[PDB]
Design a protein around this ligand. Sequence first.
Ligand SMILES: Nc1nc2c(ncn2[C@@H]2O[C@H](COP(=O)(O)OP(=O)(O)NP(=O)(O)O)[C@@H](O)[C@H]2O)c(=O)[nH]1
Ligand SMILES: [Ca+2]
Ligand SMILES: [Ca+2]
Ligand SMILES: [Ca+2]
Ligand SMILES: [Mg+2]
Ligand SMILES: [Mg+2]
Ligand SMILES: [Mg+2]
Length: 166
Amino acid sequence: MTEYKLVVVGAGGVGKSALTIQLIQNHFVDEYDPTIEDSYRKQVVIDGETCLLDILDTAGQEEYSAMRDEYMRTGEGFLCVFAINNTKSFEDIHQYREQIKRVKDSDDVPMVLVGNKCDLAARTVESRQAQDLARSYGIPYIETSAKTRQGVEDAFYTLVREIRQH
Ligand SMILES: Nc1nc2c(ncn2[C@@H]2O[C@H](COP(=O)(O)OP(=O)(O)NP(=O)(O)O)[C@@H](O)[C@H]2O)c(=O)[nH]1
Ligand SMILES: [Ca+2]
Ligand SMILES: [Ca+2]
Ligand SMILES: [Ca+2]
Ligand SMILES: [Mg+2]
Ligand SMILES: [Mg+2]
Ligand SMILES: [Mg+2]
């Protein structure tokens, strides 16, 4: 069957792991344990296709990011995650996208922009600002909450749909 290799990237603490674990394991991780490099694999049916998701959950903390580029280079699509209550994480997205372009050696890489923690009201990134960023990259913007599950399946499945367009 088809395997989709997804890679989740973004600044430390934005909820990359919590999103991936909510998708795969159906619970919310409340604590913050910084990631080095973890992988998850699950067979799912997406738009009627039985396929295998292979998801790489990467480090956002600089200290734990050694060799992240070597993990990223295998990816077929990238979830570029920021938190809607973390303006710096949103600003960081451009540098993650530049890194993606470098590791894939391409200006045309399947990606989705994800604004996580949308259950929180300390919003400093308005939807329209992120919509505009995503538009400049030619990709969709989706908001998620790893805590409530809002948008979680949609974000990952949208990334699969973006890979299918390439
Ligand atoms: N309210 C709320 N908290 C969230 C959400 N997603 C993650 N968090 C919280 O934010 C913290 C960091 O989440 P985590 O998934 O570890 O972040 P990360 O991006 O994987 N960090 P790292 O890059 O260091 O591995 C945790 O305390 C987690 O519970 C969300 O959607 N809503
Ligand atoms: Ca594949
Ligand atoms: Ca929990
Ligand atoms: Ca390269
Ligand atoms: Mg993590
Ligand atoms: Mg503002
Ligand atoms: Mg699209």
